[PDB]
Amino acid sequence: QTPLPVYRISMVPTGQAFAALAWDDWARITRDARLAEAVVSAEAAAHPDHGALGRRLTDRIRAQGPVMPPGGLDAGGQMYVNRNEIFNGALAITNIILDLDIALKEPVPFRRLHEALGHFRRGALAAVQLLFPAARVDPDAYPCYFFKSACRPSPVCSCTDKIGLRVCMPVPAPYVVHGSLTMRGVARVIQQAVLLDRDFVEAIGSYVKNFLLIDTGVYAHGHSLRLPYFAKIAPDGPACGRLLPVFVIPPACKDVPAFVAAHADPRRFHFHAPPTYLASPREIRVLHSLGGDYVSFFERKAS
Amino acid sequence: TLRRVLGLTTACVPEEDALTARGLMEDACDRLILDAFNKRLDAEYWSVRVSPFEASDPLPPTAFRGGALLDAEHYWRRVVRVCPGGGESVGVPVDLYPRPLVLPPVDCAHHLREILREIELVFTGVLAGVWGEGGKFVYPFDDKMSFLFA
Amino acid sequence: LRAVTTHDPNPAASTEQPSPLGREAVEQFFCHVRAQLNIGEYVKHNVTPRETV
Numbered sequence: 001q002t003p004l005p006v007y008r009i010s011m012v013p014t015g016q017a018f019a020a021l022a023w024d025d026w027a028r029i030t031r032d033a034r035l036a037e038a039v040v041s042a043e044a045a046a047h048p049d050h051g052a053l054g055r056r057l058t059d060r061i062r063a064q065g066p067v068m069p070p071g072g073l074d075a076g077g078q079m080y081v082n083r084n085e086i087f088n089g090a091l092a093i094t095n096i097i098l099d100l101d102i103a104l105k106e107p108v109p110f111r112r113l114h115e116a117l118g119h120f121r122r123g124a125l126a127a128v129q130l131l132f133p134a135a136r137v138d139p140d141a142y143p144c145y146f147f148k149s150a151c152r153p154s155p156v157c158s159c160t161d162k163i164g165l166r167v168c169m170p171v172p173a174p175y176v177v178h179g180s181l182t183m184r185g186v187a188r189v190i191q192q193a194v195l196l197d198r199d200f201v202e203a204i205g206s207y208v209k210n211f212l213l214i215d216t217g218v219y220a221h222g223h224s225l226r227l228p229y230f231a232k233i234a235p236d237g238p239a240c241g242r243l244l245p246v247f248v249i250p251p252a253c254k255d256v257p258a259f260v261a262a263h264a265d266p267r268r269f270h271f272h273a274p275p276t277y278l279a280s281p282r283e284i285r286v287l288h289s290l291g292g293d294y295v296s297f298f299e300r301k302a303s
Numbered sequence: 304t305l306r307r308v309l310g311l312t313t314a315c316v317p318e319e320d321a322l323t324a325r326g327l328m329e330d331a332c333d334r335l336i337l338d339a340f341n342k343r344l345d346a347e348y349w350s351v352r353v354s355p356f357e358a359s360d361p362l363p364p365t366a367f368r369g370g371a372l373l374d375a376e377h378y379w380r381r382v383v384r385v386c387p388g389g390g391e392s393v394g395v396p397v398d399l400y401p402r403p404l405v406l407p408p409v410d411c412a413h414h415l416r417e418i419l420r421e422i423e424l425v426f427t428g429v430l431a432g433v434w435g436e437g438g439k440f441v442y443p444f445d446d447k448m449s450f451l452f453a
Numbered sequence: 454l455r456a457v458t459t460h461d462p463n464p465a466a467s468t469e470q471p472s473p474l475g476r477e478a479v480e481q482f483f484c485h486v487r488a489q490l491n492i493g494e495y496v497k498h499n500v501t502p503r504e505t506v
């Protein structure tokens with residue numbers, strides 16, 4: 001049944017394969033990155049504070065998934081080591097997916113990073129509320145999912161200069177987004193809203209080199225983005241940098257176990273995954289334009 | 304739409320009446336385009352008839368393999384338009400292939416523009432005649448509705 | 454420089470006028486730079502949403 005997801009696999013030692021899949025084994029893909037509901041409940045009972053709870057859960061999950069089995073393998077056996085989703089211009093976007101690429105001059109801790117993520121979540125939600133005015137977005141309960149590329153040669157961080165992150169958040173109902181330009185505009189607005197947050201800048205501004213975080217060129221027909229739970233292929237050696245969840249719990253979360261378990265749902269990190277409604281949409285508003293080519297006010301005035 | 308507009312004119316109002324008529328016409332066009340989406344996958348509904356005395360798309364080489372289906376073409380040729388790529392917009396002789404057909408998405412934007420031209424002709428004529436308006440009637444399709452098919 | 458020019462040496466009967474240098478610059482340019490900072494203002498000035506129901 002179609003539409004289907006088409007992925008681009010990076011074969012070793014060179015070459016690119018393609019895979020159009022009607023269904024897949026996601027339980028096997030996300031297996032060694034899951035926390036038993038009993039463990040989550042016990043930790044929630046232990047630590048009431050949500051920052052501490054999220055850091056504890058992140059530490060627990062980090063020390064669970066050892067490795068995805070690497071080696072040789074043909075395209076059918078490598079689609080479980082590397083996999084990128086290709087943006088299709090004939091479909092609608094139901095998730096806002098941001099590929100953050102921070103650049104540092106001094107290594108950042110992980111508690112500082114968690115605080116910075118908690119601050120980032122606050123401004124992005126305000127930007128989203130401004131962009132989608134007909135939807136009720138609660139800034140202290142809306143779910144946002146954070147993934148951080150693993151560390152290769154409170155969990156410690158051994159990164160060198162760059163901290164790769166992925167942020168996923170559903171488009172508020174009853175809104176849908178159509179177009180590659182529209183998504184670029186949404187990314188622009190999100191980045192501007194985040195960069196204006198005083199708390200986020202104060203918390204993370206010391207270590208960073210530049211304040212250009214969200215790459216807005218990843219939204220183009222045919223371009224591919226790496227999926228969570230998949231590692232980059234290094235021709236030099238083995239796979240590295242798996243994207244694994246970094247739990248940043250909302251302050252007003254009412255179901256912590258559900259939030260934790262929603263990080264392994266493949267529908268939460270795909271561009272055109274079907275929306276998760278409750279009964280049925282009585283009406284949906286498609287945002288099919290957000291202006292156009294942007295340039296800038298400083299550019300128009302100067303010209 | 305014309306029935307509604309000419310029935311509104313009976314109540315009588317100044318140029319405000321012309322503005323109301325323009326609004327009604329735009330609403331009618333919007334509803335027509337919205338209802339044309341549910342028939343986006345039907346190829347015989349969007350197929351248009353062509354006479355032997357007009358310019359038509361060249362016959363695809365695969366149309367000559369129909370066999371007994373080419374024995375029923377004597378005057379009219381029904382051609383639909385499909386988009387197999389970026390902007391190809393090729394033409395398909397619907398009646399020269401066995402059924403069911405397996406085609407790419409239909410080019411409903413081009414067909415809808417062709418129909419909207421005729422619709423706007425009538426609406427502009429009505430506006431110019433009943434209320435003396437030099438302003439032509441134009442419907443924004445590429446700005447407000449072209450996303451449903453792209 | 455035309456605003457700060459004088460044609461009478463007497464300070465009381467001088468022909469100097471206020472300079473519209475800072476005022477014009479602020480009104481035409483520096484207002485929008487600050488207007489950018491507010492996120493709501495930024496969205497209001499650098500986005501034109503188009504949505505269909």
Ligand SMILES: [Zn+2]
Pocket residue numbers: 149150151156157158159163
């Ligand atoms: Zn790290």
